Amino acid sequence: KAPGFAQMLKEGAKHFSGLEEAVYRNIQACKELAQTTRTAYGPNGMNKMVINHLEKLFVTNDAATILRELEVQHPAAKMIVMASHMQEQEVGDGTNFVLVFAGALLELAEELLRIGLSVSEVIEGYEIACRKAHEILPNLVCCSAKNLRDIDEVSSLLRTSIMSKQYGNEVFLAKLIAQACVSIFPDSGHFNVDNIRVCKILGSGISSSSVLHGMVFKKETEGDVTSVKDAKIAVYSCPFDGMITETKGTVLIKTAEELMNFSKGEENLMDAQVKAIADTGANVVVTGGKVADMALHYANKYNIMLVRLNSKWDLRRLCKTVGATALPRLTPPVLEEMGHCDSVYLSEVGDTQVVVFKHEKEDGAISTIVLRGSTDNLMDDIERAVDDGVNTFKVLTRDKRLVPGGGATEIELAKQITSYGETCPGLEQYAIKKFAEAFEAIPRALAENSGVKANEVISKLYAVHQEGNKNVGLDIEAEVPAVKDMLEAGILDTYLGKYWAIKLATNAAVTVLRVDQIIMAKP
Amino acid sequence: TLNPKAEVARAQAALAVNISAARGLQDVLRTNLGPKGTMKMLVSGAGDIKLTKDGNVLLHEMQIQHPTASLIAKVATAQDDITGDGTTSNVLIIGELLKQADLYISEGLHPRIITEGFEAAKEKALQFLEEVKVSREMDRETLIDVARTSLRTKVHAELADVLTEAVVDSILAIKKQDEPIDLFMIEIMEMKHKSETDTSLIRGLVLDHGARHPDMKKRVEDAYILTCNVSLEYEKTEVNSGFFYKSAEEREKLVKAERKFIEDRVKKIIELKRKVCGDSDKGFVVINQKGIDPFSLDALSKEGIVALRRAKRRNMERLTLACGGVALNSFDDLSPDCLGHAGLVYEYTLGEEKFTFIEKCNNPRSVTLLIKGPNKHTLTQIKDAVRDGLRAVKNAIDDGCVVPGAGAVEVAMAEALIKHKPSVKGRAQLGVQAFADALLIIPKVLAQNSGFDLQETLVKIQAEHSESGQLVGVDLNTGEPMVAAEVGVWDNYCVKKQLLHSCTVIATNILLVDEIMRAGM
Amino acid sequence: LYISEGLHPRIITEGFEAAKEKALQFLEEVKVSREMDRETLIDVARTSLRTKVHAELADVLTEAVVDSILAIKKQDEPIDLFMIEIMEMKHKSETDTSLIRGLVLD
Amino acid sequence: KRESGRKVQSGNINAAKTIADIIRTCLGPKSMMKMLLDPMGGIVMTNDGNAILREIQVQHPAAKSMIEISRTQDEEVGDGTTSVIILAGEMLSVAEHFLEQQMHPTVVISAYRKALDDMISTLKKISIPVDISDSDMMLNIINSSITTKAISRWSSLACNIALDAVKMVQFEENGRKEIDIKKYARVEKIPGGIIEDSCVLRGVMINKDVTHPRMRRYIKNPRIVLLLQMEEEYIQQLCEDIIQLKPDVVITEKGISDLAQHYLMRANITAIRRVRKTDNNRIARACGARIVSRPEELREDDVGTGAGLLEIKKIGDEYFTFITDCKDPKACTILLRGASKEILSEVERNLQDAMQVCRNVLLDPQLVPGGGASEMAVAHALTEKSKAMTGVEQWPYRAVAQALEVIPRTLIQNCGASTIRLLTSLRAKHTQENCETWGVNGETGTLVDMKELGIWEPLAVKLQTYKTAVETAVLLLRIDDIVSGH
């Protein structure tokens, strides 16, 4: 019966009418995305009881893990999530900056559209303010990395990135990752997170961790050989077990003596198979699955170092470094597809023997952080801090420029942008002023997660900045809502982290504002 | 009075259904008119996303619920193939024509009388283009305004200045000798691992697969390019014999025996290399399309030869024109006739992949437009814009006449049709009035998308008159009147010509629909 | 039609006030200030009476309506329709209407 | 189960009237369009009365009879399908006599049949002769169908094709002037070229392609034949008697397998196969050949002597075999050229209906005034003839006359003019002025004479139109019991 739905003619999709504010609905999908991560922002971030797709329980506060597990189906939210994925490129931090800032730009845009300002004029203001923010951000650069490759320097600046992922233990992790990062910075112009690997081992606690060179593997050496300097490393994916012939190979056995004869024939064949490994000049062998009992002694017969890597990612980790690729057959003497390594030895650290691939002959630009923890979920959450911590200094290989943190830049950058909008006549000042208030959402996130009235933090942060006391941020404390200097406390953020975050967040917000109707299709 | 499994609207409700569909389709596409207009998303269901303002993609790729609206969608497919632009504005005029026709049809006017007014106004409207069309000679500055006028309607006003100079020079690279411009002479290549503003032109072709060996020259300043289609990998026995083996070792002997089919021919490449200017200060290149063994890649690299593999058929035809070497289907009949000549042949390195470039050609009569972008959807977005920008300059050169934009022709033709009485009957005066008010939807919609009042903007440009031929259009940034010639806002002649002929035909046929019968639906 | 396009009502009403003054001035030019004679008032009475009868009482009531007015105005005197009494009687056809120079009493 | 009584006749009227109300507005040059909703959402805005009812699935048996009769009308005559259904529906829409007055159908059928004999008598009085020998006069008549078509670019060529092709098939010696376009004027599409290259071939064409070069490329006197070891010997002998005559082409009715084509290729002749019986009869008349039972019984008389020539010339990426002659062997073939299949399809159906127009005009050189003039002229005669019609049949006799007014009624409705005002003035013109003129203008909407506007239609189209409409109305009125049964 008429009048039915208005503006609904494309596959019956939910087309919001002019009264229902179709633009207001795509914004609400992005605001809900911020609330899921607004609480995890800062050192006092709240953890999320995430339930994996395998019905696994994980308690974490990392933004990338929340969104990867939260199936975001709304396309308007996917754009901001795609900015978070683009945030991971060129920098390894500032993900929640994209979610919190963009959510404030869209949330504040509704206050403009409700007044009657056109969406095309709102976009011009944010694009003007983003360009203006990039001019003010260099002026806020307080300190810069000396690049002395000092662990005292690298660990000091790294404390800010480690916090908000694993709080409280920022002293140990800053020293260890500093020891791992300093050992590669001499390799000028080649630093990457792929070199600094991580190996988690069940242990007492986080304090029992340390750093070791080479590609470390937690699985101890199964063989009886302690050390071997052989370059040819033969990697096989098929485990050491009862052979099967790719051709017919029909095996008929009737009597009990024939069972023993065929059993002996297999052991004589396996003795020849392991013999072929030593014939190809390779005293090292790797196995994915189980390892047989007789084949184990054959590895000790020719002093072939037996290696076990049950994890698939551990196998592929070696395929791209030493070159040894896994073949489908069980011990095919294929010497061409083997690897090359300078040193392979076993080492006991923290009361645990771990396989090591050290580069003694070669210069060496690879390391590994051996983490210890009494829970697998805890070590995984600490691993996420290593990536966000190591990637912080992959950015410092570029232009070394640090800015204050703790919401300090967000108020000064807002204060400088608000003045530009007050003196700028026209309609763009409305969206330029709201671009400054979007920055205030970040201190408001830190204050709310610390149990403090956020409005009192903004009032104090603006007063000290009115007097010219820059580099002043939120004092993280439950019983003290006052502020302190981020420079004296040593809290510092990266320049490129804020640059690419303000850029990608504005493009994601503008890209959502430019959209006014979601329409289905079919190929 | 009806049969089972049958339905038919005998009254004028068939028009109210078709007229309602056009009004609905009008309100959808009017928001993406011009650069200030908003974008539409195209969700394929599987998760892919595609943003575009091009009306043809919003009608060809998207699916429409109304059956009547799908007819107008097919019209945009026809409008795109002839002119390459004007598909969105074509739908707005149809909706506004049918809107004004419904106003008079409710007063008891027959539909056929309204269609006769459109045919009279259309013939007068076409003559107005011949009077206002500017036959300015094609130059760099003129085509920049045309390509800017087309590219700004498909990008964020940042890739316009970047893509404008590239799209202009692409046509000028192929435009000479008064030849008909062929778009097959320009191939469009995409690349990831870079931003969006890095788009630039390539004087020559670009290939996907390149040289993969340490002993290869990173750049070849000159070479006799040899065109070939013979695989230098393990192949079957080409003589009166076969493969018969008794074990894995005897099988390996057949590989050594079968590999001799190529080893004699791989040295043949070394022979013609040393033959045709094998002395110093010379080079040699092979562009063999088929696969090549790493042995042949390892052998020829020691002689200083860049050999390529796994190319496309279309690239090989373009490569021959760039170089001059004819394709040799069998290495046994090798000769210098199969060779060409080219300039700098280097390798562009990305973060992960690498691409072959054959720049500095002699007489290719063809170029390549290298597109770069970070996202997949952004590549398809920029590709659709360049294809529209290329056809815009093509129509400007193929048809040397251009006309103003900003709805200046519509505002002018509306005043012209009002000052024109019929010659067949008096009631056609109403159809001419509907055609006049229908053309004004374009300057009306441009004021809406820019955020200005619909009525104030139109009344200003329509009130602006003088004692001379004066143009006037909508200023999207200020909302005030604007002379399109004094700012560089130009459209094509064939676009506006086909627009009047397309809208009149479809708005006519939709009005002649007297009944809608279900053919067993 | 224009309000649906986003136009305010107050703008349209200001146009009516302008169109009224232009339309009111044009009415002054079209009006015919000729002298009122019996030939002219018959055209006025017929134009007014045709809109209320079956085109049969036109000539019947026309001459009565005109003569009733001429009897109550001379020398440019102010006129009053209360001078004319309207009586009704039955037992006769509709076309039996006529004048009464005097007055009827019950 | 079963329906009888007045319910049957009242139902057949609503069915035939419903089918007619659909296509009322598809009459004339202002044919309004119809939107047919397919089940998959597909839509076609066609305005052809045949294609509309062809796709509309109906359930009532009476409506199917009204549709099938128009289909049969479409084959015998290439025009008048929409007018048969409108008149047959309008003749049945006068139910005042069937139900309110309780007139038996036999009384009305006596009136409808009496009107049909008088309607035919009135048309032949208003007829007008034709000078068919003049190519321009007949060209003015065929332009009525060529308008709004792709063949309008070279309409002079389009008329010369159909006009001569019909005259070549026109066998006037036998008196009845039998014409058969589908039999003696076979039409085939030829890829390549343009509409201007469309010409007539004085003989029979074979669309088979040349598979091997061992064939006759050019012959002055075409000798057209018409008719593993064991398979080789049985084929070796049947092919021996054929080659003994030294033929130029062998056209067998049944298939010629590979081994049979091998021995034929040794004789260097064209191998034709997969041809029908009537086609062989047409091939024999093209050159005077003889059809034989088997290859064993072939005689020296089995020759195509007298024919023009054989040719296997490749035209547009396709070989075509011709056995044409420079004479008129009771047939012809239209070689339609075109640069694409999209243009070839339009010219085929366009010229086909054009041949039907010349077929009807040449069968009898007598036209009639169209544009409602013939309908209003006939209606005036019955209205005057009914004054002397003593009996109760006068009432339905006059109703048939007023039913013919639907043709100018729909033409005036589509133009948008007042239907009553013009139809009223139109009927008055036929009373006083001559009935042979004063019709309706389908383009302008006002009245105009048919002498000044060449809308003159053939006579056979109207006779079969009124005869079919009356016989169809008489049919459904005779239906009084619709019953099932297998």
Tab-separated table of N, CA and C in Angstrom, chain D residues 443-482:
chain	number	residue	atom	x	y	z
D	443	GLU	N	-1.052	11.476	-39.246
D	443	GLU	CA	0.088	12.259	-38.784
D	443	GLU	C	-0.335	13.597	-38.192
D	444	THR	N	-1.306	14.268	-38.814
D	444	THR	CA	-1.757	15.580	-38.366
D	444	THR	C	-2.875	15.490	-37.336
D	445	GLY	N	-3.821	14.568	-37.530
D	445	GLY	CA	-4.955	14.398	-36.649
D	445	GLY	C	-6.255	14.976	-37.171
D	446	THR	N	-6.195	15.855	-38.169
D	446	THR	CA	-7.373	16.475	-38.750
D	446	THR	C	-7.829	15.680	-39.972
D	447	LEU	N	-8.969	16.081	-40.526
D	447	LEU	CA	-9.524	15.411	-41.691
D	447	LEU	C	-8.791	15.840	-42.955
D	448	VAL	N	-8.727	14.923	-43.920
D	448	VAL	CA	-8.049	15.183	-45.184
D	448	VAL	C	-8.551	14.170	-46.198
D	449	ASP	N	-8.542	14.563	-47.467
D	449	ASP	CA	-8.952	13.669	-48.538
D	449	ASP	C	-7.831	12.694	-48.878
D	450	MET	N	-8.224	11.485	-49.274
D	450	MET	CA	-7.263	10.457	-49.650
D	450	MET	C	-6.769	10.601	-51.083
D	451	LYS	N	-7.401	11.455	-51.894
D	451	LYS	CA	-6.859	11.746	-53.216
D	451	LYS	C	-5.614	12.616	-53.121
D	452	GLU	N	-5.570	13.514	-52.138
D	452	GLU	CA	-4.412	14.369	-51.913
D	452	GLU	C	-3.310	13.683	-51.118
D	453	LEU	N	-3.625	12.599	-50.410
D	453	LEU	CA	-2.671	11.870	-49.586
D	453	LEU	C	-2.704	10.395	-49.960
D	454	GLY	N	-1.571	9.887	-50.434
D	454	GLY	CA	-1.505	8.536	-50.955
D	454	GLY	C	-1.484	7.457	-49.894
D	455	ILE	N	-2.584	7.321	-49.154
D	455	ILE	CA	-2.743	6.270	-48.152
D	455	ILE	C	-3.632	5.173	-48.731
D	456	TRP	N	-3.671	5.059	-50.057
D	456	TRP	CA	-4.530	4.069	-50.694
D	456	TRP	C	-4.012	2.662	-50.424
D	457	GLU	N	-4.864	1.832	-49.832
D	457	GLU	CA	-4.536	0.459	-49.485
D	457	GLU	C	-5.059	-0.504	-50.543
D	458	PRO	N	-4.567	-1.744	-50.577
D	458	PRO	CA	-5.120	-2.716	-51.524
D	458	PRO	C	-6.540	-3.110	-51.155
D	459	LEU	N	-7.198	-3.783	-52.099
D	459	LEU	CA	-8.566	-4.242	-51.883
D	459	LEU	C	-8.593	-5.610	-51.210
D	460	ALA	N	-7.687	-6.507	-51.604
D	460	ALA	CA	-7.686	-7.856	-51.047
D	460	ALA	C	-7.369	-7.851	-49.558
D	461	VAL	N	-6.632	-6.845	-49.083
D	461	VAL	CA	-6.307	-6.777	-47.663
D	461	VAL	C	-7.552	-6.453	-46.847
D	462	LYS	N	-8.403	-5.560	-47.359
D	462	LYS	CA	-9.611	-5.189	-46.630
D	462	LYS	C	-10.669	-6.280	-46.719
D	463	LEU	N	-10.788	-6.928	-47.881
D	463	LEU	CA	-11.782	-7.983	-48.043
D	463	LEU	C	-11.501	-9.145	-47.099
D	464	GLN	N	-10.258	-9.627	-47.079
D	464	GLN	CA	-9.887	-10.680	-46.145
D	464	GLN	C	-9.892	-10.194	-44.702
D	465	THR	N	-9.774	-8.883	-44.478
D	465	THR	CA	-9.830	-8.352	-43.121
D	465	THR	C	-11.260	-8.361	-42.592
D	466	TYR	N	-12.203	-7.824	-43.368
D	466	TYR	CA	-13.600	-7.841	-42.949
D	466	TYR	C	-14.164	-9.255	-42.980
D	467	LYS	N	-13.790	-10.042	-43.990
D	467	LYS	CA	-14.265	-11.418	-44.075
D	467	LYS	C	-13.763	-12.246	-42.900
D	468	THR	N	-12.517	-12.024	-42.482
D	468	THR	CA	-11.965	-12.774	-41.360
D	468	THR	C	-12.515	-12.283	-40.028
D	469	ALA	N	-12.765	-10.978	-39.902
D	469	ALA	CA	-13.323	-10.452	-38.661
D	469	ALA	C	-14.761	-10.915	-38.466
D	470	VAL	N	-15.559	-10.901	-39.533
D	470	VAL	CA	-16.945	-11.343	-39.435
D	470	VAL	C	-17.005	-12.849	-39.210
D	471	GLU	N	-16.202	-13.607	-39.957
D	471	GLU	CA	-16.184	-15.055	-39.784
D	471	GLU	C	-15.650	-15.444	-38.413
D	472	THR	N	-14.763	-14.629	-37.841
D	472	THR	CA	-14.273	-14.895	-36.494
D	472	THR	C	-15.325	-14.545	-35.451
D	473	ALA	N	-16.044	-13.439	-35.651
D	473	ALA	CA	-17.132	-13.092	-34.744
D	473	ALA	C	-18.274	-14.091	-34.855
D	474	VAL	N	-18.582	-14.532	-36.077
D	474	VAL	CA	-19.599	-15.560	-36.269
D	474	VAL	C	-19.161	-16.870	-35.631
D	475	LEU	N	-17.856	-17.141	-35.613
D	475	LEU	CA	-17.357	-18.369	-35.006
D	475	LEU	C	-17.619	-18.380	-33.505
D	476	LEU	N	-17.103	-17.377	-32.792
D	476	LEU	CA	-17.215	-17.353	-31.339
D	476	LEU	C	-18.656	-17.226	-30.865
D	477	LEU	N	-19.535	-16.605	-31.655
D	477	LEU	CA	-20.941	-16.545	-31.273
D	477	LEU	C	-21.599	-17.915	-31.385
D	478	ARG	N	-21.177	-18.728	-32.356
D	478	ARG	CA	-21.667	-20.097	-32.471
D	478	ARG	C	-21.174	-21.001	-31.350
D	479	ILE	N	-20.152	-20.594	-30.604
D	479	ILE	CA	-19.698	-21.353	-29.444
D	479	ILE	C	-20.649	-21.075	-28.289
D	480	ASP	N	-21.366	-22.113	-27.850
D	480	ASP	CA	-22.261	-22.026	-26.705
D	480	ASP	C	-21.974	-23.077	-25.639
D	481	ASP	N	-20.940	-23.901	-25.808
D	481	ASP	CA	-20.627	-24.933	-24.824
D	481	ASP	C	-19.146	-25.265	-24.917
D	482	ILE	N	-18.365	-24.769	-23.963
D	482	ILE	CA	-16.948	-25.092	-23.840
D	482	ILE	C	-16.844	-26.259	-22.868
